């Protein structure tokens, strides 16, 4: 589709069999989504943002259903505030910033 | 243009005469920028991002040429990590996700 930027960009995803809100971020690297269970193995990574540096895990090959589009990639599971789907999967689905 | 996120969706802005690379961030409501002096008054706000809250200086319309288009509206100011364009001046310049 075409979403325009008046608000949010908020989308649903399915990971790890569980639906959720997420925000497409054009402005992170990484995907980062709020604490839960992901199998599999994991290893701790430290990012930054604005405030500072969170510890997150980082899941890799995790496969998330976005806005209905799946794509597969590693996965940041930690303290942040809000889901963020980052480059790494916004790619994955073809999405294309455009003015 | 249509911007693709295999890279950071980094662009040139101008503003105060000094031109910056800022990111386009569909993830930010707000435009943020690294400290600088900008002219007129400005107000308090306090901004949260992935790892806590920041303090800002909030200037209202400013002049900002983003990659050669004319924006002019509300810049914060503060100890962001990285120059960040966000919704408030993305929709000045028609910007939108297409997947
Ligand atoms: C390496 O992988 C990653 C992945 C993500 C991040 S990130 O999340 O730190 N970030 C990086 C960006 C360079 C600032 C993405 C933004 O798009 C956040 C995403 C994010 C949204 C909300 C809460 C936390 C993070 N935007 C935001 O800080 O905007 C605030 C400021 C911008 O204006 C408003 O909009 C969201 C808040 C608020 C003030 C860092 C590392
Ligand atoms: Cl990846
Ligand atoms: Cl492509
Ligand atoms: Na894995």
């Known amino acids: 589709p075409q979403i325009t930027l008046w608000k949010r960009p908020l989308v649903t995803i399915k990971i790890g069999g569980q639906?959720?809100?997420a925000l497409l971020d054009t402005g992170a690297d990484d995907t980062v989504i709020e604490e839960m269970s992901l199998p599999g193995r994991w290893k701790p990574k430290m990012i930054?943002?604005?405030?500072?540096?969170?510890?997150?895990?980082?899941?890799?090959?995790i496969i998330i259903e976005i806005?209905?589009?799946?794509?597969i990639g590693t996965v940041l599971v930690g303290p942040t505030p809000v889901n963020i789907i980052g480059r790494n999967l916004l790619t994955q689905?073809?999405?294309?910033?455009?003015?």
Chains 1, 2 share one sequence.
Not at 49 to 60: A, H, M, N
């Open 19 to 21: 639906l959720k809100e």
């Open 48 to 61: 930054g943002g604005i405030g500072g540096f969170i510890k997150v895990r980082q899941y890799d090959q």
């Open 67 to 71: 806005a209905g589009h799946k794509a």
């Open 93 to 99: 689905i073809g999405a294309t910033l455009n003015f």
